[PDB]
Design a protein around this nucleic acid. Structure first.
Ligand code: MG
Ligand code: MG
Ligand code: MG
Ligand code: MG
Ligand code: MG
Ligand code: MG
Ligand code: MG
Ligand code: MG
Ligand code: MG
Ligand code: MG
Ligand code: MG
Ligand code: MG
Ligand code: MG
Ligand code: MG
Ligand code: MG
Ligand code: MG
Ligand code: MG
Ligand code: MG
Ligand code: MG
Ligand code: MG
Ligand code: MG
Ligand code: MG
Ligand code: MG
Ligand code: MG
Ligand code: MG
Ligand code: MG
Ligand code: MG
Ligand code: MG
Length: 117
RNA sequence: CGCGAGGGGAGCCCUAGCACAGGUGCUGCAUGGCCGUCGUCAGCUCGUGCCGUGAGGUGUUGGGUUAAGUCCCGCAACGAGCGC
């Protein structure tokens, strides 16, 4: 059921701003706009979710991100819809690499929670 | 130490020798301290992270505002320290 539903409203986008690398996943080009190979997506979808489901049962925590507005809140709801960590709230420098100093901002939010109740 | 003779010790004083004092003599280019100054100027940096072979850069820049690096929004940065 995954297939046609993608063709539902989830393929083809952009034009003349692509990247030759991505070209292998491309199918054609109508109206000047690029048409993505729907059938090939399906394959990558399988391999991906294999890892997704795997790391899920492994109990891993996935970090979701998308500051882009056209996916702003969609990242939000789906996040609590799994308890999985995430940030579409505009990314930051050292989110992961400087996770130490960043997490201190959290420990400060905890303290604010302390006076918030 | 004795009844007293007399002698002797502390102290202080002078005379004597020695140890040593004393110096507003030099060096602020050997120094502490304190003070003047740019300046009551908004400025000067640290930790971590990222960029760079490196000196270093980023933050501290940008837009708004203030007496002000004041605050705000923004931002590969997140905070913090001596400063207002
Ligand atoms: Mg803080
Ligand atoms: Mg006698
Ligand atoms: Mg006698
Ligand atoms: Mg006698
Ligand atoms: Mg006697
Ligand atoms: Mg007698
Ligand atoms: Mg007598
Ligand atoms: Mg006599
Ligand atoms: Mg006599
Ligand atoms: Mg005598
Ligand atoms: Mg005696
Ligand atoms: Mg005399
Ligand atoms: Mg004399
Ligand atoms: Mg002299
Ligand atoms: Mg001096
Ligand atoms: Mg002032
Ligand atoms: Mg530090
Ligand atoms: Mg450092
Ligand atoms: Mg350096
Ligand atoms: Mg900062
Ligand atoms: Mg500076
Ligand atoms: Mg600088
Ligand atoms: Mg900048
Ligand atoms: Mg600023
Ligand atoms: Mg300013
Ligand atoms: Mg930001
Ligand atoms: Mg900033
Ligand atoms: Mg301040």
């Amino acid at each position: 059921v995954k297939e046609l539903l993608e063709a539902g409203v989830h393929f083809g986008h952009e034009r003349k701003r692509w990247n030759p690398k991505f070209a292998r996943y491309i199918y054609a080009e109508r109206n000047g706009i690029h048409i993505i190979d729907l059938q090939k997506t399906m394959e990558e979808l399988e391999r991906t979710f294999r890892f997704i489901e795997d790391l899920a049962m492994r109990g891993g925590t996935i970090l979701f991100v998308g500051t882009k507005k056209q996916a702003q809140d969609i990242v939000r709801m789906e996040a609590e819809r799994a308890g999985m960590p995430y940030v579409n709230q505009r990314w930051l420098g050292g989110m992961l690499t400087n996770f130490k100093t960043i997490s201190q901002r959290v420990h400060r939010l905890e303290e604010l929670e302390a006076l918030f109740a």
